[PDB]
Amino acid sequence: MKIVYWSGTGNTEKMAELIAKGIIESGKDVNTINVSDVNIDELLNEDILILGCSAMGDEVLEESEFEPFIEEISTKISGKKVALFGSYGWGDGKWMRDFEERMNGYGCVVVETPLIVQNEPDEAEQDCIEFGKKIANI
């Protein structure tokens, strides 16, 4: 499987690692890719797209790299399964409610409830591993 993410300080990156750990513990392989090093062509062959990005700007996806990437793949992902995650700070998840609505609008099937964790995953570490286990079980 593949996990593509954007992280500004490392919080979403850590969530990605823990989610990968859960998939691996389930007996499956998985690669975590920073959005800047992603190959759209190969990514589109995946059964499930695992995407993560922290809450940026005023409750939006990161604008210079992650957002353009979502727009790029938007026309080629209808019917695909997606799992969404990300770290946030002061809000209550508005950027993720919007991200989920958006992916749904592109024709994707959001397999699990988006996983959002405030700041760094410390107390939420197991939740991250469990999210990975749920995904590897689909």
Ligand SMILES: Cc1cc2nc3c(=O)[nH]c(=O)nc-3n(C[C@H](O)[C@H](O)[C@H](O)COP(=O)(O)O)c2cc1C
């Ligand atoms: C420029 C900027 C804008 C932000 N906007 C939001 C926001 O609208 N809502 C929110 O809850 N957190 C917001 N945050 C906080 C980050 O989502 C939060 O610090 C998160 O843990 C960062 O994860 P990262 O290291 O993966 O990027 C913002 C952070 C920055 C730097």
